[PDB]
Amino acid sequence: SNITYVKGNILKPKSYARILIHSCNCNGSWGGGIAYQLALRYPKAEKDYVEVCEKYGSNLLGKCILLPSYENSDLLICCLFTSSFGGSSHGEKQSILNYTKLALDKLKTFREAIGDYLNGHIKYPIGEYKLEMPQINSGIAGVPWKETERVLEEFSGDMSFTVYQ
Numbered sequence: 001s002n003i004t005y006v007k008g009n010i011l012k013p014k015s016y017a018r019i020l021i022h023s024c025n026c027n028g029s030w031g032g033g034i035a036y037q038l039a040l041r042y043p044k045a046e047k048d049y050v051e052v053c054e055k056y057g058s059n060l061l062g063k064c065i066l067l068p069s070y071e072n073s074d075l076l077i078c079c080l081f082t083s084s085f086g087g088s089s090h091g092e093k094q095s096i097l098n099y100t101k102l103a104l105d106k107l108k109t110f111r112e113a114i115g116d117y118l119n120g121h122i123k124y125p126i127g128e129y130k131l132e133m134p135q136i137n138s139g140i141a142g143v144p145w146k147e148t149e150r151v152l153e154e155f156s157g158d159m160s161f162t163v164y165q
Protein backbone atom coordinates (compact mmCIF):
# COMPACT_ATOMS: atom_id res chain seq x y z
CA SER A 1 0.00 0.00 0.00
CA ASN A 2 2.16 2.83 1.38
CA ILE A 3 5.48 1.31 0.18
CA THR A 4 6.79 0.51 -3.29
CA TYR A 5 9.48 -2.15 -3.24
CA VAL A 6 12.29 -1.86 -5.82
CA LYS A 7 15.17 -4.18 -6.72
CA GLY A 8 18.50 -2.47 -7.24
CA ASN A 9 21.31 -0.36 -5.87
CA ILE A 10 19.89 2.66 -4.10
CA LEU A 11 23.33 4.14 -4.75
CA LYS A 12 23.11 3.91 -8.55
CA PRO A 13 22.44 7.50 -9.64
CA LYS A 14 18.85 8.57 -10.36
CA SER A 15 17.51 11.31 -12.62
CA TYR A 16 14.76 12.74 -10.33
CA ALA A 17 15.32 14.74 -7.17
CA ARG A 18 15.20 12.45 -4.15
CA ILE A 19 15.96 12.16 -0.45
CA LEU A 20 17.98 9.18 0.74
CA ILE A 21 16.94 7.97 4.18
CA HIS A 22 19.18 5.80 6.28
CA SER A 23 19.29 5.03 10.01
CA CYS A 24 22.30 6.32 11.92
CA ASN A 25 24.05 6.49 15.30
CA CYS A 26 24.88 9.45 17.52
CA ASN A 27 28.53 8.53 17.72
CA GLY A 28 29.73 10.14 14.51
CA SER A 29 30.64 6.71 13.08
CA TRP A 30 29.76 6.48 9.38
CA GLY A 31 31.19 3.05 10.04
CA GLY A 32 29.77 0.19 7.98
CA GLY A 33 26.87 -0.82 5.77
CA ILE A 34 25.22 1.75 3.50
CA ALA A 35 26.25 4.47 5.92
CA TYR A 36 29.88 3.84 5.02
CA GLN A 37 29.19 3.91 1.27
CA LEU A 38 27.59 7.33 1.62
CA ALA A 39 30.75 8.45 3.46
CA LEU A 40 32.94 7.56 0.47
CA ARG A 41 30.87 9.22 -2.24
CA TYR A 42 29.73 12.27 -0.21
CA PRO A 43 32.59 13.33 2.12
CA LYS A 44 31.15 16.80 2.60
CA ALA A 45 27.90 15.13 3.72
CA GLU A 46 29.88 13.02 6.18
CA LYS A 47 31.72 15.97 7.71
CA ASP A 48 28.39 17.57 8.59
CA TYR A 49 27.27 14.33 10.24
CA VAL A 50 30.35 13.86 12.40
CA GLU A 51 30.22 17.55 13.32
CA VAL A 52 26.54 17.39 14.33
CA CYS A 53 27.23 14.29 16.45
CA GLU A 54 29.91 15.96 18.59
CA LYS A 55 27.95 19.21 19.03
CA TYR A 56 24.80 17.36 20.17
CA GLY A 57 25.74 13.72 20.86
CA SER A 58 23.03 11.36 22.15
CA ASN A 59 20.65 14.41 22.00
CA LEU A 60 19.63 13.37 18.48
CA LEU A 61 17.62 10.19 19.30
CA GLY A 62 14.14 10.26 17.74
CA LYS A 63 15.36 13.13 15.53
CA CYS A 64 16.48 13.51 11.92
CA ILE A 65 18.74 15.86 10.00
CA LEU A 66 18.56 16.67 6.31
CA LEU A 67 21.94 17.39 4.81
CA PRO A 68 22.96 17.80 1.18
CA SER A 69 24.85 15.35 -0.99
CA TYR A 70 27.00 18.23 -2.36
CA GLU A 71 27.97 15.99 -5.28
CA ASN A 72 24.40 15.91 -6.67
CA SER A 73 21.98 18.84 -6.84
CA ASP A 74 19.05 16.39 -6.73
CA LEU A 75 20.19 14.03 -3.91
CA LEU A 76 19.48 15.01 -0.31
CA ILE A 77 20.66 12.66 2.42
CA CYS A 78 18.62 12.22 5.59
CA CYS A 79 19.86 10.58 8.80
CA LEU A 80 17.43 9.22 11.41
CA PHE A 81 19.24 8.88 14.73
CA THR A 82 17.93 5.62 16.23
CA SER A 83 20.84 4.52 18.40
CA SER A 84 23.65 6.07 20.39
CA PHE A 85 26.58 3.96 19.05
CA GLY A 86 27.30 2.37 15.71
CA GLY A 87 28.17 -1.25 15.21
CA SER A 88 27.42 -4.27 17.43
CA SER A 89 27.17 -1.90 20.42
CA HIS A 90 23.67 -0.86 19.26
CA GLY A 91 20.56 -0.19 21.33
CA GLU A 92 17.84 -2.73 21.70
CA LYS A 93 15.26 -3.33 19.01
CA GLN A 94 12.24 -1.76 20.65
CA SER A 95 13.93 1.64 21.09
CA ILE A 96 15.41 1.66 17.56
CA LEU A 97 11.88 1.14 16.23
CA ASN A 98 10.58 3.78 18.66
CA TYR A 99 13.47 6.09 17.69
CA THR A 100 13.01 5.41 13.98
CA LYS A 101 9.37 6.30 14.41
CA LEU A 102 9.90 9.60 16.22
CA ALA A 103 12.67 10.56 13.75
CA LEU A 104 10.39 10.08 10.74
CA ASP A 105 7.85 12.25 12.54
CA LYS A 106 10.36 15.12 12.44
CA LEU A 107 10.76 14.64 8.69
CA LYS A 108 7.01 14.60 7.96
CA THR A 109 6.46 17.85 9.87
CA PHE A 110 9.45 19.40 8.06
CA ARG A 111 8.04 18.80 4.60
CA GLU A 112 4.57 20.08 5.67
CA ALA A 113 6.14 23.61 5.91
CA ILE A 114 17.36 19.91 10.96
CA GLY A 115 18.05 21.97 7.83
CA ASP A 116 20.70 24.45 8.97
CA TYR A 117 23.04 22.82 6.47
CA LEU A 118 20.53 23.15 3.63
CA ASN A 119 20.75 26.86 2.86
CA GLY A 120 21.09 27.31 -0.86
CA HIS A 121 21.30 23.56 -1.39
CA ILE A 122 17.60 22.92 -1.93
CA LYS A 123 16.93 23.06 -5.69
CA TYR A 124 13.27 22.04 -5.52
CA PRO A 125 10.14 22.24 -3.33
CA ILE A 126 10.73 19.77 -0.53
CA GLY A 127 7.50 17.88 -1.14
CA GLU A 128 8.66 17.26 -4.73
CA TYR A 129 11.59 15.15 -3.54
CA LYS A 130 10.97 11.39 -3.56
CA LEU A 131 11.90 9.46 -0.40
CA GLU A 132 14.10 6.38 -0.82
CA MET A 133 15.91 4.12 1.65
CA PRO A 134 17.29 0.59 1.88
CA GLN A 135 15.71 -1.76 4.40
CA ILE A 136 17.14 0.42 7.16
CA ASN A 137 17.69 -1.43 10.47
CA SER A 138 17.60 -4.92 8.87
CA GLY A 139 21.37 -5.15 8.89
CA ILE A 140 23.75 -3.92 11.59
CA ALA A 141 20.82 -2.95 13.81
CA GLY A 142 19.28 -6.42 13.39
CA VAL A 143 15.68 -5.18 13.61
CA PRO A 144 13.80 -7.58 11.24
CA TRP A 145 12.24 -5.73 8.34
CA LYS A 146 8.59 -6.72 8.95
CA GLU A 147 9.11 -4.73 12.13
CA THR A 148 10.38 -1.53 10.52
CA GLU A 149 7.99 -2.01 7.59
CA ARG A 150 4.94 -1.34 9.70
CA VAL A 151 6.26 1.97 11.06
CA LEU A 152 6.43 3.23 7.48
CA GLU A 153 3.00 1.67 6.96
CA GLU A 154 1.51 3.84 9.65
CA PHE A 155 2.76 6.97 7.88
CA SER A 156 0.37 6.20 4.99
CA GLY A 157 -1.40 9.26 3.59
CA ASP A 158 1.38 11.42 5.11
CA MET A 159 4.46 10.23 3.15
CA SER A 160 5.20 7.54 0.54
CA PHE A 161 8.35 5.44 0.40
CA THR A 162 10.31 3.61 -2.27
CA VAL A 163 12.23 0.71 -0.70
CA TYR A 164 15.28 -0.96 -2.29
CA GLN A 165 15.60 -4.74 -1.72
Ligand SMILES: Nc1ncnc2c1ncn2[C@@H]1O[C@H](COP(=O)(O)OP(=O)(O)OC[C@H]2O[C@@H](O)[C@H](O)[C@@H]2O)[C@@H](O)[C@H]1O
Pocket residue numbers: 009010011023024025029031032033034035037082083085086087090091096134135136137138139140141142
Ligand atom coordinates in the same frame (compact mmCIF):
# COMPACT_ATOMS: atom_id res chain seq x y z
N1 LIG B 1 26.69 -1.82 -0.05
C1 LIG B 1 25.36 -1.87 0.55
N2 LIG B 1 24.83 -1.40 -0.59
C2 LIG B 1 23.48 -1.19 -0.66
N3 LIG B 1 22.65 -1.46 0.41
C3 LIG B 1 23.20 -1.92 1.55
C4 LIG B 1 24.53 -2.14 1.61
N4 LIG B 1 24.82 -2.61 2.83
C5 LIG B 1 23.68 -2.72 3.52
N5 LIG B 1 22.70 -2.31 2.73
C6 LIG B 1 21.31 -2.29 3.17
O1 LIG B 1 21.10 -1.21 3.83
C7 LIG B 1 20.10 -1.56 4.94
C8 LIG B 1 20.53 -1.00 6.15
O2 LIG B 1 21.93 -0.78 6.12
P1 LIG B 1 22.76 -1.21 7.49
O3 LIG B 1 24.23 -1.30 7.22
O4 LIG B 1 22.22 -2.55 7.88
O5 LIG B 1 22.55 -0.15 8.76
P2 LIG B 1 21.31 -0.33 9.84
O6 LIG B 1 21.52 -1.62 10.58
O7 LIG B 1 20.05 -0.44 9.02
O8 LIG B 1 21.04 0.94 10.85
C9 LIG B 1 22.02 1.90 11.14
C10 LIG B 1 22.73 1.40 12.36
O9 LIG B 1 24.00 1.33 12.04
C11 LIG B 1 24.74 1.63 13.35
O10 LIG B 1 25.65 2.51 13.13
C12 LIG B 1 23.66 2.14 14.36
O11 LIG B 1 23.32 1.08 15.36
C13 LIG B 1 22.60 2.42 13.63
O12 LIG B 1 21.40 2.18 14.43
C14 LIG B 1 20.11 -3.06 5.03
O13 LIG B 1 18.78 -3.43 4.50
C15 LIG B 1 21.00 -3.49 4.19
O14 LIG B 1 20.32 -4.49 3.41
